[PDB]
Subunit: 698 residues, 2 copies
């Protein structure tokens, strides 16, 4: 059911865990470096887990997709055919940006963080800067030992701070991927849908140097030896059984003010969806003409289609459950309860009023700020502004540089500058520049930016067309020229005639002022959010309820049971799909073109010892009332005993309004059953040596 | 499961009956005039049943629709509002044509029927004439007792004959009908559909004279006092429970030869569906520009549209289960098994080959036969041919008149000629004449009819115009003129210069010849069909299977269990719907506009003591694997103890092939739960006097 629990609080919900069917102790699963949770690793946007003592890792197929594609050629197309490395020497590099993060140490630093913050006083901007300086020093000390990357997380609006130290593994290799018509069966048609029949898995192996320390790719590297790895369930997973997921959910907003919900539902989501559908259409149209565009902008357009449809999907969800009235009523209950407290309820009511004040301030400039951020996020302007800003930060001592522009960030910046070549074509980027400038000049007069108005020299189509002609002269389209600017001094930026640079130099004082205004507001938030969130927690507790923090990229556990749902009277989604359902969907055409070996194996009922008699077949995917969101792709599903029964890979469409509210009736995770992994690797695209490594050989 | 069993054979399926959960003895339910099967009555078209010892009858709302309409005005709309009679003196006549038939006596006449047929020797036409004569005198002698109507039914190709003598009750009155948004909730949108939420029921009362004998409506009549009547269940109906239906299915063709079925699927269905769509388009377009056309041809066009959709639906459903291949393989198994026997198998193989040959004969003239039938069934041509044929049959004595033209048929004939006024406009009939003459002039020369060619005088567009212009002069438009011809003698027909009667005189010798050809073939089928069906039954017995005759309007029992179905992997239709499901569909516009007392009672959860806790609500409708077809509307559904738990009113769209096949996975009957009858009558449109009469209220 609902809840993204921090592992440290699982002992306080022993009652619900046990009732749902947990057989390990709460204490055992609260150990973030223990068995099983110490097997869970972060890939940087997806979850994965160790599944052998020789560093084999399992995750979703769409999580490995970049690595599979990276190693594919026209005549050896691994996306379509699959990949298998029968020995560890056959494994292929997932590329210099691939990472496995293994948790080494967690520290609660809440006391020192709150002291660093209090020492700043009444000044909001200085509160933000104190916390920045606190965080930077923490990270720098923690990372002084090579091989580790550290992160500071704020929980519950700044009620709690914890510091995570992770081993940063940098040699990650592909070991297995099923054919793409397994890993992505149903493609975009089945996305967010149940019934689901998708074998969404792939395997990596993690490598380090012979000295046991992380290293970049080298033939001299050997597999990492994890301290904990998951084992396949020996018990067949059935309807009603306990399941739990561990992983790194990104962001939820379950505790937001009602007017914060309203502003999102009424403005943010429709504005963004509209813009993204506009951009999607121009890219789709242009890509039909020019296959270079289509290739290079495909990941980009897919990103847009995702968010755009998630937001149409949340919008729709909000209507179905009347999210607006639900928030207003809940907040009315909380505010009435606080009035009923003393004197001692006042600080939280003042905090509430302040948060509404901050929201009003952000709203006054919201068109200006979004349109300017997205204009500047086009490829050449994003690059020029980012490179000029780095040049400005390089004049400061490293400890004072902005996050994102410190020494420790340089490789990721250099990496981004190269990677841009894979997703940039001038004629397309000009069309996006154009769109955004057209949106800009449509802004009301009080939403404008003086620097941009001066640079344009007017507020009409003619000024737009002049600006595009001016900008077309940039050289920042070559990787080689971007890397020159990466190394360049700010005087060089400020003397340049490159028109993308001159735009950056012209706007940057403005960007810094808007940044400083964001940070002032954030400093106020830092004072008021935690006070309000604590009162929410006390209110919930007075009503008998447990509380969990909104997602914030750190490790969480969610639990529940395997179960379908009923979207209307007279019908039910059943909790499992089966092999024969995969074959009923076959059309012989992408995306419903299963490998022949799969069709043959199902026609023959080669169940390979894996069938569950209760469903009459080998299960494919299953539903459960777990609570996940972006970031949880590739999370292991564990049973009551902490054994692997699945990977998370999606949710139902009704789930996506989850971010704001959690609808217990309808919200379900979709997982791929561990038996289906085993079945594919036995009967369809075989990997007997991996199954042997995981002690599930025939 | 599959089977439309005659009651006499139930003892021989004691095993399967008991296994499905029947608790009465098969012997008890085998008695057609017994408890409970004697309570089941025929309305003509529809099934109903007695539910009190004072003649109360329950059937479907759509079975009672004609009576509700008859008793409605513009100002008092019983269709919309419902009807309730608080005392029996309030009940209103269903009109002079309304009938309840109650079985009085059944006699097996197989021996005498087969003797009459055998006396004709090897003369095929004389075999047909011998059965006709046997039937006509058996029915006349049975019916010489006033008050009774008799039918002779042939079973299994003529392997068995039974005579049914029914009490013919003629004073039938409406006692209760729920409001139309209950009786037909979801209208044509929810036709054939599950989930379903329709309260498809209504009540009549049957009346007889004070002497106990049938009589037409009179205020001196009293309620009929049935020998047997049904009681409401007292055990709550749940999923998996035994249910059985008793009713009068019209016709099935489950044992059609492979080639017969192939001809129907490949030629008959697509060809009729084509003509029907063309006629539909012609009436749609004409009705726009008229409104008399539009109103008078609505039902006709509906009926075409229905058959058209059902034929297309059956073709798709045939492909979905490979009906043709299953039939070919079972037929092959039969022929194999006969072939292995000696001489012993030869008669049945010979009869098979004879049935193939008769199919070939009818195939040779299929185009001509269909075109000529449908040309002659246009309204004026239909009227003229029928009336002239009647005049020919008159002037034989009644005992020799072809059935459909005897004295006992003259009320249905008179009926037809008046009713025609409801559905005839000359401008439209002309177009339908035109369509069919244009079909006709496409016939090959060897498919032509000389007498039609002569009358046409030509074979091109101008011939057809002359003919239509000619036919337009008829006077058979007017109901009064048709009634003249209905009483005129053969000689008046043959002098008349009414152009439609002239057409009929010209074509009638040909029609008669063709009738004689059909009867010759029917005579050959008399001899070959039962011999093949007997071999079919013998083969089946060798396989451990029981065989039921095709439906033929006699009383049949089907049995099985309440269960849903899964049309695809990952989902299920559940066996019941609930009250809350009704309200979730509310839009309040027709046809999703429930009465307000319904919305209010569901919102208050006034379940009236009727809720089944296993579903959390009062049941509305439910699914089961019973085998029904047209004729079964209104059939009572009984539980393991022979107590009433619902009425059959529809099937899922997978039932649309009930003539040809049963699919045990998908075919389901849809019934209204007797608890929903009761709930409506308690909480929504109250009828406390009927509930008390049925011993389920005070
Ligand atoms: Zn530990
Ligand atoms: Zn800063
Ligand atoms: Zn005859």
């Amino acid at each position: 059911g609902e809840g993204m629990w921090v592992p440290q609080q699982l002992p306080e919900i022993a009652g619900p865990l046990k009732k749902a069917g947990l057989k390990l102790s709460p204490q055992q699963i609260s150990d973030l470096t223990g068995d099983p949770m110490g097997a869970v690793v972060a890939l940087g946007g997806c979850t994965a887990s160790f599944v052998s003592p020789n560093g084999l890792v399992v995750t979703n197929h769409h999580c490995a997709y970049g690595a599979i594609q990276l190693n594919s050629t026209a005549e050896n197309n691994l996306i379509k055919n699959g990949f298998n490395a029968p020995t560890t020497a056959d494994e292929v590099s997932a590329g210099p940006n691939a990472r496995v993060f293994v948790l080494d140490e967690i520290t609660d630093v809440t006391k020192d963080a709150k002291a660093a913050i209090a020492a700043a006083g009444d000044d909001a901007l200085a509160r933000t800067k104190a916390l920045e300086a606190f965080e930077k020093k923490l990270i720098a000390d923690c990372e002084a030992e090579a091989g580790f990357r550290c992160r500071l997380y704020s929980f519950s609006g700044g009620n709690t701070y914890r510091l995570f130290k992770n081993l940063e593994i940098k040699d990650v290799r592909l070991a297995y991927a099923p054919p793409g018509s397994v890993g992505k069966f149903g493609g975009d048609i089945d996305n967010w849908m149940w019934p689901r029949h998708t074998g969404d898995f792939a395997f990596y192996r993690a490598y380090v140097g012979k000295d046991g320390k992380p290293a970049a790719f080298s033939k001299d590297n050997v597999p990492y030896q994890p301290k904990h790895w998951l084992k396949f369930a020996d018990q067949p997973l059935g309807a009603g059984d306990f399941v739990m997921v561990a992983g790194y959910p990104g962001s939820t907003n379950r505790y937001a003010l009602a007017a914060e919900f309203d502003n999102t539902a009424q403005w943010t989501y429709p504005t963004i969806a509209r813009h993204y559908k506009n951009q999607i259409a121009m890219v789709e149209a242009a890509g039909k003409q020019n296959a270079d565009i289509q290739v290079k902008y495909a990941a980009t357009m897919a990103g847009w289609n995702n968010t755009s449809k998630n937001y149409d999907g949340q919008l729709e969800g909000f209507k179905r459950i009347d999210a607006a009235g639900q928030k207003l009523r809940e907040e009315a209950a909380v505010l009435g309860w606080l009035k009923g407290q003393g004197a001692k309820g006042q600080p939280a009511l003042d905090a509430h009023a302040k948060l509404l004040d901050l929201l009003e301030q952000s709203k006054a400039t919201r068109d200006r700020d979004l349109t300017l951020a997205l204009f500047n996020n086009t490829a050449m302007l994003g690059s020029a502004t980012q490179l000029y800003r780095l040049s400005i930060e390089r004049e400061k001592p490293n400890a004072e540089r902005e996050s994102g522009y410190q020494e420790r960030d340089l490789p990721a910046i250099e990496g981004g500058l190269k990677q841009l070549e894979r997703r940039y074509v001038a004629a397309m980027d000009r069309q996006l520049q154009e769109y955004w400038l057209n949106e800009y000049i449509k802004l009301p007069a009080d939403q404008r930016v003086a620097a941009v108005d001066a640079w344009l020299g007017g507020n009409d189509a003619a000024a737009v067309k002049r600006a595009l002609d001016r900008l077309a002269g940039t050289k920042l389209g070559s990787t080689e020229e971007r890397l020159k600017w990466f190394a360049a001094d700010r005087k060089a930026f400020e003397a340049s005639n490159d028109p993308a640079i001159q735009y950056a130099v012209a706007v940057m004082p403005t960007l810094l002022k808007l940044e400083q205004e964001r940070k002032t507001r954030a400093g106020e938030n830092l004072a008021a959010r935690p006070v309000y969130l604590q009162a929410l927690a006390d209110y919930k507790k007075s009503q008998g309820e447990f509380v969990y923090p909104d997602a914030n990229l750190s490790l969480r556990i969610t639990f529940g049971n395997v179960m379908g749902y009923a979207p209307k009277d007279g019908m039910e989604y059943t909790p499992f799909t089966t092999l024969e359902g995969v074959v009923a969907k076959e059309t012989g055409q992408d995306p419903f073109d299963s490998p022949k070996a799969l069709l043959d194996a199902v026609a023959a009922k080669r169940y390979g010892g894996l069938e569950d008699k209760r469903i009459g077949s080998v299960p494919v995917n299953y539903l459960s009332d777990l609570d996940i969101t972006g970031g949880n792709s590739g999370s292991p599903v564990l049973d009551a005993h902490g054994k692997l029964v699945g990977l998370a890979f999606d949710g139902n469409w009704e789930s996506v309004s989850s971010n704001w509210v959690f609808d217990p009736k309808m919200t379900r995770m979709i997982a791929v059953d561990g038996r289906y992994l085993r079945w594919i690797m036995q009967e369809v695209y075989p990997a007997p040596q991996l199954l042997k490594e995981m002690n599930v050989g025939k």
